[PDB]
Design a protein around this ligand. Structure first.
Ligand SMILES: Nc1nc2c(ncn2[C@@H]2O[C@H](COP(=O)(O)OP(=O)(O)OP(=O)(O)O)[C@@H](O)[C@H]2O)c(=O)[nH]1
Ligand SMILES: [Mg+2]
Lengths: 198, 719, 62, 112, 106, 178
């Protein structure tokens, strides 16, 4: 949509780009959401998707309270991170250069985690950078653990999960390569890339 | 103003976004100072270049500038004869001292007295220094020609020369004339002494034990042991001593040496030169009639391709174990850091040894490629395959990746190492030595008393500043049942003098009635356990120096030895035959995605070579040559990288925009369009810290300029 | 005894040397970080300089 | 005691190392300041250019626009700057610390 | 704006001058303490004096480094802010030019 | 691997210019007499690396007390005579054959001429004719070399370096192969 609209209504697209890019950070969330919704309608790549936030905000039940919902959201990332190493035993998790991903579509978990975390923690006001940092730290520790042993069946595709961590850091804007280097050397990722390419 | 206040200011920066061993100790130091001077004379010879070519030539006797061309040659090559005088004087004195030391130590007292282990290693390094210097003098040729030109010029000018000057000049010419003069002089002065073969056997036996038990941490020491063993064997053969008779007497085992030579055949002496360990055996006097005993001469395991699986597995497991270790802890944690640091250094040394040994073997074994080519071309360029080059750069990248990690943890490593050594030494001295002291006190063992007291007085630390007076061991009576003593805890390592003295005393207790016959089982078992565990304490204390020395790969560029063999028709080899460029060029031309990210690790080798030359060689023309080579090498690398990046992206866009139905129909017909293989230029593009020759280079800017020009050209072509 | 005094003095040296090493390590890291920030700043500056030149040429008359 | 003298020598060496560290920091700060000062001049010059352009562009009169003939190509086609940096590792562009490491080490045509 | 030129030509040159003065002081004090220890009859007092001097030097050096690093970071941040403001003005000018051109084409 | 070569002959026959040209690729005319000199080279012959130590001996009558010590522990002997000097040619028969053989009887001997470029020069041969001397020719050397039992007879010219690579190449072939 962005490519199509670029050569159709350049004036409106240019005004939107300037409006979004130069929006002050100190502004409230309501105005920012309005800008993102308009930006999304224009096809721009907003970091936070207003549509996801709106869809996720329509939920309620008997035992729902703000404090327990926040705890559930925080615990969801921990569960995902601890479950990530289990993919190493999957045969269909073989990364291939011809696909730049995996046959089981596990390379899209990076954007799924980022979008889900951003929407959940902007609804509940919780910080995003700190939460993502904790998720990366837990994932890095677990990924190092699984690679420590030498079981053939359990670690058949350990390289594939390593590339997933690299994808998570790259796609995530709140996460920088400096944090990954502190918690995960880039040497392992380099070796994984060589092994799969072979 | 105070240590605590200064530490707080520093912390703010971090948040920002017996007289018998005294006599031997003095002798050991004297030999060490001589070895350093010998390496300086060895470096002077290796960095020697023909200065006579620049001197103008005279074709007729009527030249107005004949006298002046001779003045010139003399000034220029005067500073070079003076150092030759010093070198000849140094080697003459060094041989005299070595022979005298052997004369002192070969007396009948040897049958009773034992000799230290560090001393024997020093002697081995001494003879190795003689061997390398002899090779440098023998192989070098420009030295003799330069001296001859200077002598002729002086004679023509008659620089008012006197009787002693001509005698010295004639002596130097003969000294450089004689083949293997150093070896012949040493052997002649050593054959007179009777029993020198026994001391040589002890040195060889010590080297075998060290090599077998992995008693080393740096590749240089590993190669030194083999060189010492080979040189010692060559010296043993002669008109007085025979190795075969000694072997039949069980004094020396030759099977172990043969197996080691078979496994490893080539070691580097100094610089690009190499020595075949089997050469010493070939030159043995008694080798002709007993050549069947040695099987290492006949020539299978240097294929680095098949040795990469273990390297990758070892690299991954160590990194995984280490990455989790990125306000006081238990001694177990410090011990784990001690073990991890030792394992990392050992792994780095093993990788470095593999790379260097493969390079040395390939150089010694040239191939038999066009009809016309230089020896360097045949030795390096055409002896390497694509798989071989990829493996070498992979090992180099792993070495550097682990090196940077260890350097970052240097602070934590240093604290753990210092804490562990202090605790182990104090606990051993204050507890493990109580029982032997009690036994010696109970039954008069004055000899044991002196050594134990010296060990417990040189390094022991007392919390109260004095030795307790209630110790049962001192009084000689058996201890109750505990008399527990709380040793102090701190992070500081023993001094070099203290560590050497305690080790010598500790290892003097254990020797081959003897002084070891009055000790029980458990007492010794701890003694040797500490003896074999404290060797690396000094190495680990200076972690930074050990790490850089272990990860040194500055010998992959120097080629002075091959330049001399070109008969002076070459100033320096072209960039095509240097190893770092070959590896980089091969990666770029092949455009292999797997090895794309390893190119940078193959280009910073120039930094290591430049640092080694400046720090050790103390020469400048080598640095200038490095900069000139890098100047064009980087430009070629940038040009190729930009061109392939632009082509790869352009084809990707074209294929991505192409219709899929047409592609499927073409594939069914039999005219499928092959897709473009993916690459990994992502890391290269984002790089902005290409450090080379102490300079920061923005690779992104250069790639942007090339791509911008290419895009403009394409648009103009389209129109 | 002199031995205890030597141990204390050497401990003083060890902590001081460690402090010196920490300062040097931070100094190197700070130099690298500032240079990277400096490099990216230059990249934007040159891009702006090119863009303004293009705008001036587009609008200049004669 | 010789131990006291050895310690004092160690303290003197520590002072020397601290002084060396001070120099290793002074050169870095000086180099960065000199480089950043150049960027300040470049930014200031660009600011003046933009201000002039803004004043010029806010004065355009639409009636003043004129178009040339369709068959006129005499206008000088605009060309963008294409300066590609090269010979990067040159002796002149060497860091002062390398200079001290250089000069410290060791260092006939008319009659040929 | 004024604070910029203030730290350009008042802060960094002063720090470099302080660093040079510190270097000379470090060399002079080390020589004095060593000469005092050899000459002084009492050695413990000399040992304490040099310990105080080295601690003072270390604290001063760390303080100088911290202020210089903070000043450099502050200077870089304001430069980046100026650049971002410049980019917005350029974009507005470019947008103004392109609408002006379309009106002439229409 | 290492071959020791000593060159002997009459004075002013071209042994220094010969060795200097081989090692440094330069020539000269000045005559600086030589009590002793040393030169070295590293060349590959028959596909193997060979180190060539070269020893220069004075031929002047007076300096006969430093010549004998260069003889022992040698591999090959080089005898050089000037093609434009019959006196040097006969000295090989009168001497330099017994002198080398007496000190080293079982060592191979290489005999090669010198000053080949001057053999065809008319000016030099004419002046030799005023002395009633005639230059040596190729067959004469063949007979002399056969008489003294040398391996080969070759000819050289340092100025033109026409046959100066061959003489050293064949000298190594004389010791390493047989
Ligand atoms: N034309 C010509 N002249 C030569 C040649 N070789 C030497 N000469 C000249 O001969 C002179 C003396 O000959 P040398 O080569 O010095 O003789 P040498 O063998 O060293 O004998 P000594 O007289 O004992 O020193 C030189 O100064 C040259 O001028 C040659 O190949 N051609
Ligand atoms: Mg001569």
């Amino acid at each position: 949509l962005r490519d199509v609209l670029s050569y159709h209504i350049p004036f409106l697209v240019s005004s939107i780009e300037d409006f979004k890019d130069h929006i002050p950070r100190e502004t409230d969330m309501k105005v920012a959401m309005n800008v993102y919704e308009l930006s999304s309608a224009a096809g721009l790549p907003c970091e936070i998707d207003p549509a996801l936030v709106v869809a996720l905000s329509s939920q309620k039940s008997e035992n729902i309270s703000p404090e327990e919902e926040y705890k559930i959201a925080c615990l969801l990332m921990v569960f995902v991170a601890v479950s990530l190493p289990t993919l190493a035993s999957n045969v269909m998790s073989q990364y291939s250069p011809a696909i730049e991903g995996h046959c089981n579509n596990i390379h899209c978990l990076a954007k799924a985690i980022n979008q889900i975390a951003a929407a959940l923690f902007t609804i509940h006001k919780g910080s995003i950078e700190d939460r993502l940092k904790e998720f990366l730290a837990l994932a890095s520790s677990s990924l190092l653990k699984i690679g420590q042993e030498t079981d053939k069946t359990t670690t058949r595709n350990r390289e594939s999960v390593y590339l997933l961590l690299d994808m998570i850091v790259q796609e995530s804007p709140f996460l920088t390569m400096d944090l990954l280097e502190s918690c995960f050397p880039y040497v392992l990722l380099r070796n994984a890339y060589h092994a799969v390419y072979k | 103003v105070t240590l605590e206040d200064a530490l707080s200011n520093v912390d703010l920066l971090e948040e920002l976004p017996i007289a018998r061993y005294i006599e031997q100790a003095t002798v050991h130091s004297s030999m060490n100072e001589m070895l350093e001077e010998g390496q300086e004379y060895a470096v002077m010879l290796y960095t020697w270049r023909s200065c006579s070519r620049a001197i103008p030539q005279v074709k007729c006797n009527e030249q107005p500038n004949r006298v002046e061309i001779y003045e010139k040659t003399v000034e220029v090559l005067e500073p070079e004869v003076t150092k030759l005088m010093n070198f000849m004087y140094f080697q003459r004195n060094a041989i005299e001292r070595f022979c005298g030391e052997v004369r002192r130590l070969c007396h009948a007292e040897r049958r009773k007295d034992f000799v230290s282990e560090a001393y024997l290693i020093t002697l081995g390094k001494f003879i190795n220094m003689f061997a390398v210097l002899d090779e440098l003098k023998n192989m070098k040729c420009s030295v003799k020609n330069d001296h001859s030109a200077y002598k002729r010029a002086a004679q023509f000018l008659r620089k008012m020369a006197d009787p002693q000057s001509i005698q010295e000049s004639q002596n130097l010419s003969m000294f450089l004339a004689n083949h293997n003069k150093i070896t012949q002089s040493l052997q002649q002065q050593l054959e007179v002494i009777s029993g020198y073969e026994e001391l040589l056997a002890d040195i060889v036996n010590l080297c075998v034990d060290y090599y077998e038990n992995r008693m080393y941490l740096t590749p240089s020491e590993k190669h030194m042991l083999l060189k010492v063993m080979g040189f010692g064997l060559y010296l043993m053969d002669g008109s007085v001593s025979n190795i075969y008779k000694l072997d039949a007497k069980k004094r020396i085992n030759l099977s172990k040496i043969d197996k080691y030579f078979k496994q490893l055949q080539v070691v580097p002496l100094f610089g690009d030169m190499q020595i075949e360990l089997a050469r010493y055996i070939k030159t043995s006097a008694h080798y002709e009639e007993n050549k069947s005993r040695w099987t290492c001469t006949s020539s299978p395991q240097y294929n680095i391709c098949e040795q990469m699986i273990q390297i990758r597995e070892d690299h991954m497991r160590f990194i995984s174990e280490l990455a989790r270790y990125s306000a006081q802890k238990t001694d177990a944690e410090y011990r784990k850091l001690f073990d991890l640091a030792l394992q990392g250094l050992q792994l780095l040394s093993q990788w470095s040894a593999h790379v260097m040994e493969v390079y040395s073997w390939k150089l010694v074994h040239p191939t038999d490629c066009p009809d016309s080519a230089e020896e360097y071309e045949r030795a390096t360029r055409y002896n390497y395959t694509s798989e071989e080059k990829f493996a070498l750069v992979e090992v180099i990248a792993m070495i550097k990746g682990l090196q940077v990690l260890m350097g970052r943890m240097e602070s934590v490593f240093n604290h753990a190492i210092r804490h562990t050594v202090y605790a182990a030494l104090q606990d051993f001295s204050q507890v493990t030595l109580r029982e032997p002291l009690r036994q010696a006190i109970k039954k008069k063992k004055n000899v044991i008393q002196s050594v134990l007291q010296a060990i417990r007085k040189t390094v022991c630390d007392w919390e109260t500043g004095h030795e307790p007076f209630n110790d049962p061991a001192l009084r000689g009576e058996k201890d109750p049942k505990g008399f527990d003593i709380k040793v102090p805890r701190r992070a500081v390592g023993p001094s070099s003098t203290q560590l050497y003295m305690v080790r010598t005393m500790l290892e003097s207790l254990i020797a081959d009635k003897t002084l070891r016959s009055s000790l029980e089982g458990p007492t010794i078992l701890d003694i040797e356990k500490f003896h074999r565990e404290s060797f690396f304490y000094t190495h680990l204390i200076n972690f930074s120096e050990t790490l850089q020395q272990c990860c040194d790969l500055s010998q992959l560029w120097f080629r002075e030895f091959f330049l001399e063999l070109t008969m002076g028709r070459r100033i320096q080899f072209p960039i095509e035959m240097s190893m770092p460029w070959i590896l980089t060029d091969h990666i770029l031309e092949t455009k292999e995605a797997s090895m794309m990210e390893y190119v940078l690790y193959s280009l910073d080798l120039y930094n290591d070579s430049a640092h080694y030359a400046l720090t050790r060689f103390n020469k400048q023309f080598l640095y200038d040559e490095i900069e000139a080579e890098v100047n064009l090498c980087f430009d070629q690398f940038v040009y190729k990288l930009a061109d392939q990046i632009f082509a790869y992206y352009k084809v990707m866009a074209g294929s991505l925009l192409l219709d899929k139905r047409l592609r499927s129909e073409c594939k069914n017909q039999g005219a499928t369009i092959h897709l473009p293989p993916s690459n990994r230029y992502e890391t290269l593009l984002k790089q902005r810290h290409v450090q080379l020759l102490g300079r920061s280079i923005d690779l992104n800017r250069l790639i942007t300029q090339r791509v911008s020009a290419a895009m403009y050209k394409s648009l103009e072509l389209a129109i | 005894r002199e031995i205890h005094q030597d141990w204390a003095n050497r401990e003083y040296i060890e902590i001081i040397t460690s402090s010196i090493k920490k300062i040097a390590d931070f100094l190197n890291s700070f130099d690298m970080s500032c240079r990277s920030r400096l490099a990216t700043l230059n990249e934007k500056l040159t891009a702006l300089e090119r863009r303004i030149e293009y705008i001036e040429a587009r609008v200049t008359k004669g | 005691n010789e131990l006291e003298c050895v310690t004092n020598i160690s303290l003197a060496n520590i002072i020397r190392q601290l002084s060396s560290l001070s120099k290793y920091a002074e050169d870095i700060f000086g180099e960065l300041f000199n480089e950043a000062h150049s960027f300040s001049f470049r930014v200031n010059s660009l600011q003046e250019r933009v201000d002039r352009l803004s004043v010029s562009v806010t004065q355009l009169d639409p009636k003043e626009e004129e178009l040339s003939l369709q068959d006129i190509t005499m206008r000088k086609a605009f060309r963008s700057s294409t300066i590609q940096d090269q010979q990067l590792f040159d002796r002149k562009t060497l860091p002062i610390p390398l200079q001290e490491t250089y000069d410290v080490c060791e260092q006939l045509t008319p009659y040929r | 704006m004024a604070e910029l030129q203030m730290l350009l030509e008042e802060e960094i040159p002063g720090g470099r001058r302080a660093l040079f003065d510190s270097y000379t002081n470090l060399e002079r004090v080390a020589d004095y303490c060593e000469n005092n220890y050899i000459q002084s009859a009492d050695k413990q007092r000399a040992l304490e004096e040099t310990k105080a001097y080295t601690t003072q030097s270390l604290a001063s050096v760390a303080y100088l480094i911290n202020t210089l690093a903070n000043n450099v970071l502050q200077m870089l941040d304001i430069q980046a802010s100026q650049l971002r403001r410049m980019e917005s003005s350029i974009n507005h000018i470019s947008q103004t030019v392109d609408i002006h051109k379309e009106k002439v084409a229409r | 691997q290492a071959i020791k070569c000593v060159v002997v002959g009459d004075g002013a026959v071209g042994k220094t210019c010969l060795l200097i040209s081989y090692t440094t690729n330069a020539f000269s005319g000045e005559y600086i007499p030589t009590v002793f000199d040393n030169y070295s080279a590293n060349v590959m012959v028959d596909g193997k690396p060979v180190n060539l130590g070269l020893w220069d001996t004075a031929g002047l009558e007076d300096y006969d007390r430093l010549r004998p010590l260069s003889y022992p522990q040698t591999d090959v002997f080089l005898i050089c005579f000037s093609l434009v000097s019959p006196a040097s040619f006969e000295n090989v028969r009168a001497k330099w054959y017994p002198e080398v053989r007496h000190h080293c009887p079982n060592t191979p001997i290489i005999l090669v001429g010198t000053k080949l470029d001057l053999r065809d020069d008319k000016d030099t041969i004419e002046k030799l004719k005023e002395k009633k001397l005639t230059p040596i020719t190729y067959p004469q050397g063949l007979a002399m070399a056969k008489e003294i039992g040398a391996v080969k007879y070759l000819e050289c010219s340092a100025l033109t370096q026409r046959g100066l690579k061959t003489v050293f190449d064949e000298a190594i072939r004389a010791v390493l192969c047989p």
